[PDB]
Design a protein around this ligand. Sequence first.
Ligand SMILES: CC(C)CCN1c2nc(Nc3cc(F)c(O)c(F)c3)ncc2N(C)C(=O)[C@H]1C
Length: 280
Amino acid sequence: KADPSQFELLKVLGQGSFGKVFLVKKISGSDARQLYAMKVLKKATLKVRDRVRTKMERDILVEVNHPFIVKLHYAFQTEGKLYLILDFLRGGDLFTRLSKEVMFTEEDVKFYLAELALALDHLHSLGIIYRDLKPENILLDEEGHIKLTDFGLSKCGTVEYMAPEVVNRRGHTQSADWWSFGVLMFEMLTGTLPFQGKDRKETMTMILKAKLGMPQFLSPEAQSLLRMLFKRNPANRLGAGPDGVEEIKRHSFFSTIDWNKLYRREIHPPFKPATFYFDP
Ligand SMILES: CC(C)CCN1c2nc(Nc3cc(F)c(O)c(F)c3)ncc2N(C)C(=O)[C@H]1C
């Protein structure tokens, strides 16, 4: 029953390889006056191979139901367009936050990573992996909690976050997601990528071959988790073992986290998105 005429276009949020994203307002029904992001894709720009992908991307968001992953409200099509109605996130993104603070404190990082660990495990329980886990894809809501975007959802990319088995085209499993999580952790704490060369080729060679030089301002606990996430063999990596995410959750780095209070959004976030008068 849902169609494009049921949504008032306010402003265009962005545009790229995906399609065009608008900030829309629902005009009809129970959720009338509610704001959303409308992702529009033109069928003419999608090829026979690109068609199967978008299909799977909608087929994934329908299965996904987690507080730290973007919700698909509606999805519909026309003769030449494909629409996805998703959450509108006011809070911003980690990319914009990190580029502003330069580096986050251990306490800030611990919060974002704990929230992300729950979202990644949910995806892995459904047989889904996150192809491009970078800070551009981690949005923040009105309260300051994370929301993982759908751009990287799967059953090309930023090489700096790619695991050795992915650089070497050997396969993207859930273990490759725990490497990118370490890359993300490292970047948040140092303000620098762990593997970075003079160009893309040297960076990729270093992801495969370079020993990581651990900056010593990193706490003993942060260093232990990174060393364990940065194993070249994916079967040796933290999160690949018998208890999976419980290996990450039980790590000393996360010992101050209450995984129950964090899930229910009872833990106060590091950032809270957007008085003088006096009389006796
Ligand atoms: C062009 C896209 C990348 C712009 C992304 N973006 C936003 N996106 C969303 N929701 C949203 C969630 C999705 F899972 C999704 O795939 C999507 F298309 C949109 N809300 C608010 C913003 N605002 C205000 C922004 O400035 C930037 C950060």
